């Protein structure tokens, strides 16, 4: 399987090769919406 993409855009899997930006659900920040 793959880990869900925490970003709102791009593919279903985190670190989607064709995704450049990461829009995080409200209240989270980072390249993986960590903080």
């Amino acid at each position: 399987q793959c880990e869900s993409n925490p970003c709102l855009n791009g593919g279903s899997c985190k670190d989607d090769i064709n995704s450049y930006e990461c829009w995080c659900p409200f209240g989270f920040e980072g390249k993986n919406c960590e903080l």
Partner: protein, 299 residues
């Protein structure tokens, strides 16, 4: 006496040297068997989808659990994952790019769509089958689940419980953005939060006999809806049914949450603290716990 068969199907693959999976399987199958009761002429058929090493593992587990306490007739059947994968592929290929991790279309993902084409895979002598995850714990007689087939309204082909996390609220983000007033991805009792595939009542006859259901399996329908919903997933059958459930909720008899009480809270801690509770609430007497995302089941 006119023998009456009941059919369950479980995926059980890559189980050699997977002790966590074997222990889950052990909890599921012992609870199932300890609590099951069937009349004398009835037989419970346990179908397992497995490659050859996992077939051997399952046989070792099963011999320890059979015959069941309750002394009813039980038959075990194995289906080769490789054979099923090749039968599924023509039907299922076009959906894979939308619902598999991540892209594009790999044989290894085809088996995760088994339920969507189960009516083309199982012989015609099987009219109905219940597909179940192995990370379940049964708190009642599985025979009772079969009466839910009786509650299918005309046109319904599948019985399935709602997804109890906001994963589809997240997945449908763009569609929700473009359609502020949508119920798509909202929590119950009035939202459409999508489906969980851990427990599914596949009415094979009704699936075979539905013009609507057959059409939705067509490559161009799959593509039109995935475009309309801007939908991308990696959860396979669960994603496809969720999607077509947005367009055609008539197809699905929604099971009560107590028939698939999901324990996973991964999404709570990934951006959905506020709303999480509204998705996750389930009350009533629990019939099946589902320890999804490797969540310990309580006792």
């Amino acid at each position: 006496v006119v023998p009456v068969d009941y059919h369950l199907l479980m995926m059980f693959t890559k189980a050699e040297h997977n002790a966590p999976l074997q222990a889950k399987a052990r909890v599921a199958l012992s609870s199932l068997l300890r609590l099951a009761k069937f009349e004398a002429h009835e037989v419970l058929n346990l179908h397992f989808v497995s490659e050859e090493a996992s077939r051997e593992v399952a046989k070792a587990l099963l011999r320890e659990l059979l015959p069941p306490a309750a002394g009813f007739k039980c038959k075990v059947i194995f289906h080769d994952v490789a054979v099923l994968t090749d039968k599924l592929f023509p039907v299922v290929e076009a959906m894979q790019k939308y619902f598999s991790a991540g892209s594009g279309t790999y044989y290894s993902d085809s088996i995760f769509f088994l339920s969507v084409a189960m009516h083309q895979i199982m012989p015609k002598e099987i009219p109905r089958i219940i597909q179940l995850d192995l990370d379940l714990k049964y708190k009642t007689n599985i025979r009772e689940l079969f009466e839910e087939f009786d509650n299918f309204l005309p046109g319904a082909v599948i019985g399935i419980a709602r997804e109890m996390q906001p994963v589809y609220r997240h997945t449908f983000w763009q569609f929700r953005h473009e359609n502020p007033k949508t119920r798509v991805g909202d929590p119950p009792p009035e939202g459409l939060p999508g489906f969980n595939s851990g427990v599914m009542l596949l009415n094979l006859e009704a699936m075979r006999q539905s013009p609507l259901y057959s059409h939705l399996l067509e490559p161009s329908w799959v593509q039109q809806l995935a475009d309309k919903y801007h939908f991308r997933g990696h959860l396979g059958d669960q994603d496809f049914f969720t999607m077509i459930g947005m367009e055609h909720p008539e197809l699905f008899h929604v099971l009560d949450c107590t028939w698939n009480r999901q324990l996973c809270t991964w999404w709570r801690d990934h951006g959905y603290s506020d709303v999480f509770q509204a998705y996750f609430r389930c009350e009533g007497h629990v019939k099946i716990y589902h320890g999804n995302c490797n969540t310990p089941i309580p006792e």
